[PDB]
Design a protein around this ligand. Structure first.
Ligand SMILES: CC(=O)N[C@H]1[C@H](O[C@@H]2[C@H](O[C@]3(C(=O)O)C[C@H](O)[C@@H](NC(C)=O)[C@H]([C@H](O)[C@H](O)CO)O3)[C@@H](O)[C@H](O[C@H]3[C@H](O)[C@@H](O)[C@H](O)O[C@@H]3CO)O[C@@H]2CO)O[C@H](CO)[C@H](O)[C@@H]1O[C@@H]1O[C@H](CO)[C@H](O)[C@H](O)[C@H]1O
Ligand SMILES: CC(=O)N[C@H]1[C@H](O[C@@H]2[C@H](O[C@]3(C(=O)O)C[C@H](O)[C@@H](NC(C)=O)[C@H]([C@H](O)[C@H](O)CO)O3)[C@@H](O)[C@H](O[C@H]3[C@H](O)[C@@H](O)[C@H](O)O[C@@H]3CO)O[C@@H]2CO)O[C@H](CO)[C@H](O)[C@@H]1O[C@@H]1O[C@H](CO)[C@H](O)[C@H](O)[C@H]1O
Ligand SMILES: CC(=O)N[C@H]1[C@H](O[C@@H]2[C@H](O[C@]3(C(=O)O)C[C@H](O)[C@@H](NC(C)=O)[C@H]([C@H](O)[C@H](O)CO)O3)[C@@H](O)[C@H](O[C@H]3[C@H](O)[C@@H](O)[C@H](O)O[C@@H]3CO)O[C@@H]2CO)O[C@H](CO)[C@H](O)[C@@H]1O[C@@H]1O[C@H](CO)[C@H](O)[C@H](O)[C@H]1O
Lengths: 264, 267, 265, 255, 267
């Protein structure tokens, strides 16, 4: 999209709370995955959907701004800044409910281990690339995973292109944002691996991310729609029995937008 | 929110207020201030009734400010605007005591230092801090003398938008039940870091040279309603381990020094 | 050697590249992994297989020719100005169920972790290497380019060990490092972390850009209309149910912006 | 209008005997709250030195005088490489292995001011029976484990104020600049940087550095690097000297 | 000392020198260059006599610079001035060999990587680096062929100002005995980081885009006396662990790339 210079009614602000999609084994275990399996053979590994955390995504409708989309010059909503926040970090200070003792007489074991904290803001669905730890993994019916996985899907298999158009459908272990695309999206993620990794989570209402690219253009919202994507795997929760399930927390988005002139 | 006009400072347009806020970890008895009650583990999800003393709570103090004697009948008045804050965790060196009631790390070895999960948080606002409730266990039966999410549901372990509250009472709101609400708090600036893990080393910096500017994106700091300021804090440093192996949350006081200026607002 | 002149304005180009990792690939089914790793082999008889040895990844990217005559005193060359680069598939390691080893009874699988090395380079010619060995008496396998005539000093400085990254899946990571005494026409960046329990920390974003201009404002100049991207992304060790370990690698993406620069000829 | 003073400050870990300088006495554990009487040598203390400065005034009744003003400081922990000694009196990590390096809880701290550092007392155990030859919070109460504003003091004596009892007072210290970092945990790896290129500016928000009262400059330090583990498994704090290099300028003040 | 005058600019005013500095970890025999001798532990303070091969030493090289003065009988002269340095630890990827003489971490597992206490240090000066002696154990009986603090006393474990030296000899000054002296070194820039702990992960970055400026607060870089430049280094990466459990310090070479300019000075 060919963009024009900036104007100076011109602004709008939208909010969103996004629930995590860790699996939710039953009604009582929202924010969690099903117990995790281990030591499954590469040739016979069939994870349950509830064992697989998925990307969270919400399409946010923006106020109509064009009467006629055939006009040579139209206005689009341009995402300029975002404040974003992981919600409920203190909840993990509960070391008494269904926890596993660290030692005799001791407090319960805190949530810890591998984590992935990720967010994206774009004027389209996040564009994804497929990469698998095990290409022979038999993925459940209620998930969208890389079609026709091959030996190359554990490295680069360019055929595995997708978009994040469904909430609670695209497994995190299957997809990453595609850096060869996503011109109209800004995304940020950090993966930390290791069963003993301490979660480090910062909260504030003073941190802003500018969404303008190198030419000073933020994501341009197609069809007056804004897309917010998220993953916030905080780590593993350890049951008294020693079983473990992924723990996720909601993510808040506060996007500021401006009206931008574009060629049409 | 509140419509402000431009900045215009002269002589005696500034003021400075100080505050020491004690931690509210639980205080099992008079001899254990700054500590919680020993912590339980492995409680059934459907029958978990924590004691109030086991639950660290948010600290909050309302600081009165000098009366600017403004009559709220006119459309133009002056309000105190918080512009900067110096804040400090108090008594970090106290944890260098590894001999009092500690558990040795090994035979002939020194006592085990306070460590594990921690949460360090502070807020400055012209109103009480606005809170959102999130629970690890929505079926948790919280004690009478705590303010916790009302009518907790299945969704309270993720997003339940009904759980809105304000930090208006000290030693009442359990840290594990509440976080600052990012969808509100227009008139508050808050800052927090959570670290999880039983072996997490505390890292605490002290200095009198660090200043936090409280002005937002439009250059406006918290506007102090009713000539009052709110400071909030949590400083869970980690766990203290008793000789027996029992563990209790450790907290330290937090110091605030806020600088304010008179600002014109619409009324 | 090369004396630069003016830059063409108005003159730009962008090139992309996905580089597969070269960890060893023991068989068709195990790409991105090395072969089972050996330990405790004697110094005088250590003969590692090629599949046990991760290698440097490299791709030569062809660019358009800009000159009709190479006898002219002034000639145009492609100048790499910026690079966006990204490790691909970081989330794949959240698979803790496939062929993993339990951390405990009833527990999840052990995540990939341990020694890692993440490295990338952009240059107008192959990356220049210096050989250094942990064990100079190592018997390196066929189909690998390793330091020739390794001596006592190859465990420290042996300046005879000079090479160029001109072949993919051939130069073992453990034998070569980029040569800081050379590489005038290359920009390289690497981080080594050692320790069997080291957590991998991997960031992803499409908003991070590295400027490739040197102190004088000149980026890599692409000789023979060729751009070289080089990478190593050893993420750590994958632990099998049995406890056997193998290096894990991931692909790396490059997006390089180039401009036409006039140069003395 | 300028001057430069420099100082080396020995650590005050306790020094049980003349052969163990830089170390504390063996540390005790698992002592009762109501009967914990630590020896002075078991308690590391703040280091402090008053640095006399050239005299610049001849009449103190004047309404306008000159005071030395501290502008910058270069500071350095001294002897960090000494801990690469893993053979002397160390405990083996494993059969045939090297000795265990100093590690564990640490506290690195320095201050520059024109007065003694002002302290606030906070105690882990308010019922601790502190030994003679130490200055500790007087009349320690139930609230001394949190906020007890009666516990005010100044760092005016070297090897007297136990680190575990006192912190710099943020409600005061207008004429001092202090910086400290505490790390807790028995396995904490010491991380120590050295250079002669790092400078700290001591000017405050108004552009004024510490003003040296009575032509005196105070330098305060604590550098508990971690725990030294003896062969027997017995442990003692380890400290290192800190170097100060302060630049001062003449400033006019009301009087 | 040296009254510094104008900087020579433009044509024939700059030079560039490079250097690879081998590490001096001890070198037990010809097959173990880059390593120390197996390390001893639990030696009693009174009977501690370390071999030289067990003691990593500072690395140093004097780099001769082109003659700049045709006549040394002048009122003022030209000196080489070090302006910038690029420096690199060489061979970091060598430690990704976990199969040669290593100790497995577990059954069927890979070899234990090099890890533990590390010290990474470099210096650029127009003189030898000036050292202060500090000892962990002052009663340590240091071996022949090492320069260690003379007449070590009770105070050598803290501040003993008598222990002054200069790094004028390669593989002679034990790293555990000496640190750069911050009370001198006016004509040298030094940088080092010590990390202690037997499980500490080495973290080593490489690049040809990082430059350190050597100019001081006055805009003056090290002035090279007797047309000589001094590069100093220590790069203790950690401990190598043999199958048997014995451990030896590992070191790697360091590269230096220094840019110099001609400076006028009074003579
Ligand atoms: C070890 C134990 O059974 N603790 C239970 C505790 O019992 C009290 C005394 O224990 C300590 C401790 O936990 O080690 C002793 C410490 O010095 C105290 N620390 C401090 C800083 O004061 C702690 C601390 O006060 C509490 O834990 C705070 O909640 O208490 C114990 O010595 C004592 O036992 C004997 C006593 O020695 C003897 O003179 C007398 O004749 O009989 C006593 C038995 O009653 O009794 C103390 C009680 O007054 O009490 C708390 C409740 O107050 C808990 O029951 C605690 O057990 C843990 O409880 C946790 C949940 O709260 C969790 O379930 C753990 O698994 C339990 O071990
Ligand atoms: C220990 C075990 O066998 N777990 C299997 C689980 O069993 C369920 C209950 O176990 C817990 C647990 O894992 O500890 C109990 C916890 O309170 C729950 N935590 C939360 C936050 O809700 C978890 C959690 O709900 C699930 O793990 C999430 O998937 O489950 C167990 O107490 C219960 O016992 C029943 C018993 O089965 C029944 O015969 C008797 O009449 O009543 C008992 C009640 O006390 O059974 C629960 C299931 O009905 O079930 C899951 C499948 O839903 C798994 O089988 C799990 O075993 C692990 O499975 C992993 C892969 O999914 C992996 O293979 C591990 O190796 C297995 O241990
Ligand atoms: C295990 C042991 O006793 N080591 C002592 C060592 O013995 C030498 C050989 O051991 C190794 C080792 O430590 O594992 C073998 C490794 O492959 C070598 N590593 C490298 C990279 O070359 C190391 C290394 O060379 C040295 O450790 C460096 O000092 O040495 C050992 O195999 C050999 O023993 C047999 C030999 O197998 C056999 O063919 C022959 O017939 O008899 C030999 C017995 O002499 O001997 C090697 C030396 O000749 O030697 C050193 C001194 O040279 C130490 O004694 C070392 O023991 C440690 O000493 C430490 C202090 O230096 C400390 O006290 C530790 O507690 C001791 O274990």
């Amino acid at each position: 999209i060919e963009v024009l210079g900036v104007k100076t009614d011109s602004f709008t602000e939208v909010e969103c709370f996004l629930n995590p999609q860790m699996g939710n084994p039953d009604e009582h275990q929202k924010g969690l995955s099903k117990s995790l399996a281990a030591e499954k053979q590469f040739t016979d590994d069939s994870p349950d959907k509830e064992q697989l955390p998925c990307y969270s995504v919400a399409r946010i409708p923006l106020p109509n701004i064009n009467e006629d989309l055939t006009c040579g010059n139209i206005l689009m909503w341009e995402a300029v800044t975002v404040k974003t926040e992981v919600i409920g970090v203190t909840a993990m200070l509960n070391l008494h409910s269904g926890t596993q003792k660290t030692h005799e007489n001791g407090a319960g074991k805190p949530i810890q281990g591998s984590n992935f904290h990720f967010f994206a803001v774009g004027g389209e669905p996040l564009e994804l690339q497929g990469v698998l730890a095990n290409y022979r993994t038999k993925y459940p019916a209620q998930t969208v995973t890389p079609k026709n996985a091959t030996v190359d899907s554990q490295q680069m298999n360019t055929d595995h292109k997708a978009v994040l158009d469904k909430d609670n459908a695209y497994p995190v272990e299957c997809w990453v944002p595609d850096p060869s695309k996503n011109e109209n999206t800004r995304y940020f993620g950090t993966y930390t691996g290791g069963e003993n990794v301490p979660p480090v989570l910062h909260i504030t209402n003073t941190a802003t991310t500018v969404l303008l690219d190198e030419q000073g253009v933020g994501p341009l919202c197609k069809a007056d729609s804004l897309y917010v994507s998220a993953v916030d795997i905080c780590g593993l929760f350890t049951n008294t029995s020693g079983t473990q399930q992924w723990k996720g927390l909601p993510r808040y988005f506060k996007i500021t937008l401006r009206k931008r002139s574009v060629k049409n």
